């Protein structure tokens, strides 16, 4: 019987280029009328000491269920969600609000995956990715 002298291997460390945070990876808009808009926001926060270049992009078009009685999920042919701004430079210790709108065109339950891509301005190779998801349903008022 003896004390262990072993350790878990640790081949990688998270560098300072990963110090950019979003607080919620999911927003669910309230139930929104077709053709009306609903509004929410997320924030990017740069906890590092460098200026960070960032850009948001959707990973695929919105996917929508409950459009008809088929039991199929469809892809929307339009941008049901919009983010503003979609790119920028975020200074050290800065917080950027991203305003997000949901503008359905018809009954359905909508969602979409997005990511934020960022890196320190001076080190474009030191990339960091943040996933978020958007969702909301559209029901007509009776
Ligand atoms: Cl997807």
From Swiss-Prot:
Modification Hydroxyproline, positions: 61
PTM entry text: Hydroxylation by PHD1/EGLN2 at Pro-61 promotes ubiquitination.
Signal peptide, first to last residue: none
Subcellular location: Cytoplasm, Cytoskeleton, Microtubule organizing center, Centrosome, Centriole; Cytoplasm, Cytoskeleton, Microtubule organizing center, Centrosome
Record's function text: Required for mitotic centrosome maturation and bipolar spindle assembly. Appears to be a major regulator of pericentriolar material (PCM) recruitment, centrosome maturation, and centriole duplication. Centrosome-specific activating scaffold for AURKA and PLK1.
Subunit structure: Interacts with SHBG. Interacts with PLK4; this interaction mediates the formation of a ternary complex composed by PLK4, TENT5C and CEP192. Interacts with CCDC66.
Name of the featured protein: Centrosomal protein of 192 kDa
Shown stretch of the complete protein: 2256 to 2394 of 2537
């Amino acid at each position: 019987p003896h004390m262990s002298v072993s350790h878990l291997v640790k081949p990688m460390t998270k560098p300072p280029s990963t110090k950019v945070e979003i607080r919620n990876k999911s927003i669910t808009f309230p139930t929104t009328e077709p053709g009306e808009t609903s509004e929410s926001c997320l924030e990017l926060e740069n906890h590092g000491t460098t200026d960070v270049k960032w850009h948001l992009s959707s990973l695929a078009p919105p996917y929508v269920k409950g459009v008809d009685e088929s039991g199929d999920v469809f892809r929307a042919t339009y941008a049901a969600f919009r983010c503003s701004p979609i790119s920028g430079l975020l200074e050290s210790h800065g917080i950027q609000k991203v305003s997000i709108t949901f503008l359905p065109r018809g009954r359905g339950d909508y969602a979409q995956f997005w990511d934020v891509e960022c890196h320190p301005l001076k080190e474009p190779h030191m990339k960091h990715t943040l996933r978020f998801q958007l969702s909301g349903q559209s029901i007509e008022a009776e």
